[PDB]
Design a protein around this ligand. Structure first.
Ligand SMILES: Cc1cc2nc3c(=O)[nH]c(=O)nc-3n(C[C@H](O)[C@H](O)[C@H](O)COP(=O)(O)OP(=O)(O)OC[C@H]3O[C@@H](n4cnc5c(N)ncnc54)[C@H](O)[C@@H]3O)c2cc1C
Ligand SMILES: Cc1cc2nc3c(=O)[nH]c(=O)nc-3n(C[C@H](O)[C@H](O)[C@H](O)COP(=O)(O)OP(=O)(O)OC[C@H]3O[C@@H](n4cnc5c(N)ncnc54)[C@H](O)[C@@H]3O)c2cc1C
Lengths: 444, 444
């Protein structure tokens, strides 16, 4: 028999799929790239780019109100203005690359029909190797009355159909925090309804404390330990919980994301992991050794830079036979509230659960000169070492997102606290808090 | 003979001298610490702390005017308000340490009278070892009429005696840029008069370009290639130059700093270097092997974090017999205008002047997603490698001061561009510009 096949097919054209496409070109292969929906996927269109833009607008108006005492809020039109930036970035960063790089693009929904083939738009596409990069979708909880009453997800909260006065946010991790701060800074009365007893319960305890303070400082009502029983429609929307009824103009779901795995995977011998994403080994290879997967479809951390890195590594492993990995314990995550929350590596509890000598220190941000100078004293920097190497850094403070890459690099290099002590920082910066917390390991 | 002496005397109680005092305590020695003037020296009192505070105030009001369209400038009282922060920081960071650590403090002017002794307040103080950390003072150029007409230095520009409408700044390096932006953002008409053909002429060429644009964007008149011949008094102060007369309410000298070396050094066998600072080897030891020196008195880079590090290293080398050094080519410098200018390591020209394979790349800030998102597209990131190791990073952009410590750490570790490529950053941050410029080494 002979069965000529493409060398590589990539399923999905978001951050992971683009990274795969680029890598494939670099290794001398013209891939087939199959996607549906807006080019560039979640990040550029309904994710990191429009969300950070609206938080920037929120921030500059908040500062303007503090300085002037005026009640100036961002105009409702600022949501529509941001659509110009999205369009420009989608063009320059994604659409223009489809002209520059070599690729057979197909727009449509792919589903596996064999271990070496998909169907799309009724046609068979066969490939020697696949990279699955189909992303995630909003997770819609099963709550009586919710579908009938209707709700917003991120998509709608970024392009709102109307001006609202009140918002009930269901959920209490990063996206809830970001949208709650965003809408509260637009003169919307926001409540967060969180099931766990604290916000961001998989972060350091100190971070969960600060998360509450950040929200409350902008007038958000934070309700923790709550179970939502039902939703109904009154004058506005009524969320009925075991701690009372919360009425609001609109409901925003921020209860997580579900990997996009409705792909006929059983036809290709690909399995799901316990988190509902594609099951892969550390080299991003599935149970079918010709199929790799990358990005949010893995059901792991959901980050643009990690999705990109995984799309590159999956592609190289598929086309070269390499055995490359991307160490998730040096990958940073940031919540882009003001002040920022940032983390990379292990929490102290995670480190203490492994074998090894663990130390940890926490430096208050109120001790950092620059934080005093710019009136941003809320926060902290926490550093965790295992056998004398830095393995985790967690921080809350002004623009800590800008210093977390120093911490990531320190962790990749296995830097010790003396290594940081020996590195002259710039005074006065927020970043020199990394060296000040290192000094805390022996010094006061 | 017997001549009992103290183990260590430290001359000057700024950043270097404090660092020495602390280090001495850590090695089990109670030093004698001799200083004059305000405790904490330049940084806290008339340097980095009050200057960054006033630039912060300038910045938040500028943003408030952009957002509201109102003509709100910082009140003249904000200079006096900053004196509270200075006092608080002087107490917590310096005066309180004199109670916590063990030290014999003497306030007065020290001068050497022998290789092992100083005089202060008419008393002989003998020590086995000395660390000289006497700082620098403003450099006052010899210009006819200038002393009679009078001028401001940093001290006066930070605590102005009156409200002015116009300012002539003599000089064109970091402090000129910072004060020019500061006063222009206080509705003062500022002119910079610079002798060299460009601003900051020891920075990368790209930085000098950007420096001019930054100044001009706030309405500063930048005059380069000018020689100041004379000053006279008219209605206001008249600076006569070979390119015309510039009249202003006040004159600010920003023409550099002179090390404080009027110390009787010839009595102790200590010599001066070609830049007018104390001559030392890389271990901070002078020609008298019992005398070390640290900080701005060396006539090298003038930075708080470097002065601290040198005071620690000088002390350890003096008391333990070690041979430690502080590598100046991993020490960062930042100009805290908005946007910031930052640098660490070698310029491209400096690297190309040494033997080795040199590469360099420049990434525009307009290519960085976060810079687009926050409307701060002016700038660049330049990376220089020598034999495949990163040896210099230079950047202009919003809050680049916060990412320059990542670059410093990369340089200390001898990181390659692949090392940066392999480190997942956070999207969207300004800091991921370090990885984007690394990608430029092979990729477009
Ligand atoms: C509101 C919001 C804000 C965020 N902010 C940040 C942030 O600040 N920083 C950060 O790092 N991360 C952020 N994220 C997460 C980040 O956007 C994602 O982790 C990232 O987009 C992952 O990209 P991906 O390619 O793995 O998934 P996607 O980009 O969703 O890739 C899937 C793409 O493939 C196509 N596709 C899907 N299924 C199929 C199929 N069956 N057949 C054919 N084609 C298909 C779709 O068209 C889709 O565009 C945010 C997410 C959200 C929702
Ligand atoms: C306006 C301005 C802004 C600045 N901003 C920054 C910045 O943002 N970041 C940064 O890194 N750097 C900055 N600097 C530079 C920084 O302040 C100095 O490099 C730093 O203070 C050096 O400290 P030092 O201890 O070496 O000198 P000093 O702190 O001046 O130490 C000298 C001290 O010793 C005492 N002394 C001096 N001579 C004698 C003597 N003969 N006998 C006895 N005692 C003596 C004096 O009382 C003096 O306080 C700035 C400088 C200025 C002027």
């Amino acid at each position: 028999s002979q069965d000529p096949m493409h060398k590589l097919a990539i399923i999905g054209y978001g951050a992971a799929g683009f990274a795969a496409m680029i890598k494939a070109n670099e290794l001398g292969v013209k891939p087939v790239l199959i996607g549906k929906g807006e080019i560039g996927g979640t990040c550029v269109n309904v994710g990191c780019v429009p969300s950070k833009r609206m938080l920037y607008i929120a921030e500059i108006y908040k500062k303007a109100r503090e300085v002037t005492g005026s009640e100036v809020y961002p105009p409702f039109s600022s949501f529509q203005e941001k659509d110009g930036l999205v369009q420009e970035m989608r063009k320059t960063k994604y659409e223009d690359l489809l002209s520059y790089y070599d690729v057979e693009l197909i727009q449509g929904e792919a589903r596996f029909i064999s271990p070496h083939a998909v169907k799309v738009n009724g046609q068979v596409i066969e490939a020697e190797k696949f990279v699955i990069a189909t992303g995630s979708s909003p997770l819609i909880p099963r709550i009586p009355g919710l579908d009938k009453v209707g709700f917003w997800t991120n998509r709608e909260a970024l392009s709102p159909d109307r001006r609202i006065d009140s918002l009930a946010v269901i959920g209490g991790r990063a996206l809830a925090l970001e949208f709650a701060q965003m809408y509260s800074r637009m003169k919307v009365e926001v409540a967060i309804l969180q099931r766990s007893p604290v916000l961001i319960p998989d972060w350091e305890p100190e971070a969960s404390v600060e998360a509450r303070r950040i929200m409350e400082n902008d007038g958000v009502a934070v309700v923790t330990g709550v179970n939502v029983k039902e939703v109904r429609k009154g004058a506005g929307k009524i969320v009925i919980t075991d701690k009372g009824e919360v009425e609001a103009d609109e409901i925003l779901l921020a209860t997580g994301r579900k990997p996009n795995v409705d792909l006929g995977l059983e036809n290709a011998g690909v399995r799901l992991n316990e988190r509902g994403g594609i099951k892969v080994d550390d080299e991003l290879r599935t149970d079918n050794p010709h199929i790799y997967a990358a990005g949010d479809v893995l059901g792991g951390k959901m980050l643009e830079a990690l999705a990109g890195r995984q799309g590159s590594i999956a592609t190289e492993n598929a086309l070269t036979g390499s055995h490359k990995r991307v160490d998730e314990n040096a990958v940073p995550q940031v919540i882009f509230t003001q002040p920022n929350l940032a983390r990379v590596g292990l929490t102290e509890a995670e480190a203490r659960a492994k074998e090894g000598e663990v130390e940890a220190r926490v430096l208050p941000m109120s001790s950092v000169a620059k934080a005093e100078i710019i009136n941003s004293r809320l926060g902290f920097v926490k550093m965790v070492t295992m056998n004398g190497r830095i393995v985790g850094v967690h921080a809350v403070g002004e623009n800590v997102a800008e210093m977390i890459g120093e911490a990531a690099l320190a962790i990749r290099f296995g830097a010790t606290v003396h290594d940081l002590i020996d590195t002259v920082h710039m005074f006065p910066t927020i970043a020199e808090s990394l060296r000040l917390v290192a000094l805390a390991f022996r010094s006061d």
